[PDB]
Symmetry: C3
Subunit: 294 residues, 3 copies
């Protein structure tokens, strides 16, 4: 048995097809069993259209052994392209073994696994090619976003989006997202997000009220500041060049989006700004993006 | 010597360049020696233009050691993108070792080998990423087709189309076809087809008289039914949704094309159809696509 | 520690980010330390714009440990897409170990390494897929060119262009160039070129005065002959089909460009030509492309 053949075989039972249909449309993606009670993690774009049009879409989970079971949406987070599903009273679930993405190294070998019964499901091979790489992501009326991601040269496509990125111990180290290099959501973010979606059906992310574009001082140049926003109360002005958010230096607007999200809500945070040749350090207190659930 | 270096080296002598030229055009592809009498398997699109314009095209086989020998066309099958060539009275042919594609597993490592002396011939590495994956294929006045294929994440391109897909035992498990994932014709189909082309210069495939498009019941929706066709005599009507052909469930029109071909000619076969909300099981007897050679 | 993880880690300190900025623009690429005095090899397209606009561009070398040091241009060769930089009085440089690209085999495993601190720097894995493969290359007012290159199925992109292509002994066997297969400049050419750029700030290549396009006799068809050129004095005429230059057969115009460059300047060289159905062998003496530095 080949070295990758064995690892691929060992997780097949933990990876499911997810299928949303209506009267005139179908979607299909991959997901992974992360909990014996029947919790399935997939990425938010796979179920996006079912979540926005629930009166017209039905969602099913098809298991490795061909069993087909109805599924219900627990929660979703368009900002990390994650989502959680739930099947009830299904026995003999093989649960995927979650790794620790803070121990992964540039150069480790990985498999990007799609669901064995997906229409065009793929399993691909490569290495980890970069870590903590911000990447933007665009399929419905959901917001665009950016994720600190794992980069790999294994192909990530429609056939394995939502499935797991797998180390050589057959451990999940990320969730593939196709929203020729590929990217996955690191499993440690996946755990935080999924933990919060299972409890509350929602996660709350920090917000500041800024829109930025990338810059020759280099960084994220402020394009617009919302009135009443934390940014306003903190003194940020248009044409300012953000170079640091909290204790994260900021290379461009993509890294800006990610840096705001790892701030604590309602705590003071330093913002470092280059303003008409002068260096300025402001202080902002991030707002929650959704005040009722907070 | 590297692990792949050794396998690549061990088959180089079995892989030949195939070269079709005229007064104003050239084509070039790869082929593989499958028989000591001098039989070479390549894919049909590599020689397509020589086969349709034989008064103007000449075909040559260039061997690993630089020898250049004239070649003759034994037979070709546009429906599986396969073709067989023949060189005469060439001694010391190293024949490729044919594997068994029914023993290949998702995850096995493979090499996709082009001819060592091809202009831009490539040798690439990956794994088997899916099995029995229908794929459509489009370079002359030949019919389009669909093949139950091996999928791999090794790159398949002009530089190794027609060469062999190779396991770690240096055994041929498929024929690469470029007609970023790649596909190959599984060696077990290759054997059946080539066996029939060497004997008869032709192969006969079943036909039904249907054209289909993919479907929300899901499957292959009937777009047109030929008059006098087996489909007519069997009761198939336009707007019917084929969901099963023989004992093969049918996911879309691509899998429909492949499912018809593994039917026996002139034997009764069940077709399962969804017709105005009702499920219907018809009975058709496939015709040969070419009645004289049958 | 994974097998590739170890090799990647072992060269990280030899690979630097190269950064050219102005008032309104930035470029960024990878380079590699090839000499303890502080010599860095990168490819010419990474620094092209700084070299043509030196009054407005500044060039910096950022090391693995975050240190940022000014850099100066030693010499560059657009014809091989190579360039040499120099940092002064930097201690504890880990110098990259140069391999021998004449010992590399089709099938060897390789890593294509970008600088660890590059914005979007990548590290990718594959095999050597072909050797001595001419490839054309196009980012400023620099000439286009063609290089006898190493081909690999490791991805080569903006994130590792200029970095090293690495064998499993952690030895540099080529310089990646992004000017889905990738190509690198073989390390043995890199050594010759860099040796000459460090001494003279220039390299002199042979020239003949011909422009060609590819051909049904196959080869490089002569499109134009400069007046006074070596080609003129040697008898080459338009519509001639060059099939051999020196002792290198010539498949197309791309291989023509490369074959001229390995000729000796000012020595007689045979050119083989097909002219109105007849085979003709001419004699040309290549001129230097730059007569003062010669």
């Amino acid at each position: 048995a080949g070295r990758f053949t064995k690892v691929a075989a060992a997780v097949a039972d933990s990876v499911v097809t997810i299928e949303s249909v209506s009267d005139q449309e179908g979607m299909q993606g991959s997901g992974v069993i992360v909990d014996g009670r029947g919790y399935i993690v997939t990425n938010n774009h796979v179920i996006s259209e079912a979540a926005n049009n629930p009166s017209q879409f039905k969602t099913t989970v098809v298991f490795n052994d061909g069993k087909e079971v109805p599924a219900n949406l627990v929660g979703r987070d368009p900002k990390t392209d994650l989502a959680v599903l739930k099947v009830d009273n299904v026995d003999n679930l093989t649960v995927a073994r979650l790794g620790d993405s803070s121990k992964v190294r540039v150069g480790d070998e990985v498999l990007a696994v799609g669901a064995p019964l997906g229409l065009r499901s793929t399993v691909t091979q490569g290495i980890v090619s970069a870590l903590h790489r911000p990447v933007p992501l665009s399929e419905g009326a959901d917001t665009d976003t950016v994720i600190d991601a794992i980069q790999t040269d294994a192909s990530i496509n429609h056939g394995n989006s939502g499935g797991p990125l797998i180390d050589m111990d057959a451990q999940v180290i990320g969730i593939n997202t196709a929203g020729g290099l590929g990217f996955a959501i690191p499993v440690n973010e996946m755990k935080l997000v999924a933990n919060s979606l299972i409890k509350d059906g929602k996660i709350v992310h920090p917000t500041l009220g800024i829109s930025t574009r990338s810059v020759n001082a280099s960084g994220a140049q402020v394009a617009n500041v919302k009135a009443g926003s934390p940014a306003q109360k903190g003194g940020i002005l248009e044409n300012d060049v953000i170079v640091k958010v909290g204790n994260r230096a900021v290379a461009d607007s993509d890294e800006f989006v990610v840096a705001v999200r790892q701030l604590a809500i309602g705590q003071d945070a330093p913002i470092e700004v280059v303003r008409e040749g002068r260096h300025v350090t402001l202080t902002v207190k991030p707002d929650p993006d959704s005040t009722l659930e907070h």
